């Protein structure tokens, strides 16, 4: 049956939501918790038992995961626990929310039978979503969001050189690909190196499958007889000043950038 496990662990699995290989998954971890379920009574149900028990599992991913690596799993390892009598033992299952930019966590909450037998040991490992009666594994399902930059010239009163790059972040690190959009062509972006490219008047490129969180900074080559300034528009809140050369942060909001060199 589903949910039930003949045996003294607990399994856990992780599913990314994960469907573009052009998308850097975010290198970080997920934590699941268990604990007694404090308020468990009416065999007799007990409030789990701890002694002996390591209480957190956790599953890792990095950058060089893509669709075929989207699923992890761990478990938990009841085998270690001193229980003082048969029983079934009752605990609850939950995923950390790290709070982590960009990424949405799982907040269900599973509970957890564990049927002790003959010393004392575990026999059989029965899962369930909480107020819920239906079996079944533990699967936990998180998600990821990437943004994106347009930028763009514009000339009042050729072209002009410019260069980007996308700084390292913990979790997208360096020597990993972004994809552009560049002259209607699709490249490829390495992180924490100068990225070089031109425009003339209202020609654009585009980063349309950003990693959330990382830090970018923009500059044009000093361009004889004009000044240069520019303006950084997020989703629809109001345009500001972008210094060029400064670090701007990635976050959900949709970029764009409209640098205008203005003949002097």
């Known amino acids: ?7 003294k662990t607990l399994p856990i699995t992780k599913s990314m939501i994960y469907t573009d290989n052009e998308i850097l998954m975010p290198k970080t971890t997920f934590t699941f918790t268990i604990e007694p ?17 390591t209480t957190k599992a956790i599953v890792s991913y990095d950058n060089t995961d893509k669709e075929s690596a989207k699923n992890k799993t761990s478990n938990f390892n009841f085998e270690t626990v001193t229980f003082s009598g ?28 564990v049927y002790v037998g003959n010393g004392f040991e575990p026999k059989y490992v029965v899962s369930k979503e909480v107020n ?12 990821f969001k990437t943004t994106s930059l347009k930028i763009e010239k514009q ?7 410019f260069t980007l790059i996308l700084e390292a972040s913990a979790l997208y690190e360096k020597g990993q690909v972004v994809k552009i959009i560049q002259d209607g062509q699709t490249k490829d972006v390495v992180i924490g190196q100068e990225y070089k490219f031109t ?31 520019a303006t950084l528009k997020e989703g629809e809140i109001d345009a500001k ?24």
């Not at 972008?242 to 949709?254: C, M, R």
């Open 155 to 161: 000339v009042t009163g050729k072209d002009f050189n």
């Open 132 to 143: 819920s009666d239906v079996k079944k594994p533990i699967r936990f399902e998180n998600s």
């Open 37 to 53: 379920d404090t308020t468990a009574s009416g065999l007799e149900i007990k409030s789990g038992e701890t002694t002996g028990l």
């Open 86 to 113: 048969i029983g079934i033992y009752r605990y609850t299952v939950s995923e950390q929310n790290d709070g982590i930019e960009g990424i949405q966590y799982d907040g269900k909450k599973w509970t957890v039978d």
């Open 1 to 7: 049956t589903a949910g039930v496990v003949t045996g």
């Open 241 to 264: 000043e972008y210094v060029l050369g400064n670090l701007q942060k990635t976050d959900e909001s949709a970029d764009e950038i409209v640098v205008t060199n203005k003949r002097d």
């Open 199 to 229: 425009l003339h008047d209202h020609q654009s490129i585009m980063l349309a499958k950003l990693p959330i969180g990382i830090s970018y900074k923009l500059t044009e080559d000093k361009a004889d007889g004009y000044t240069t300034t």
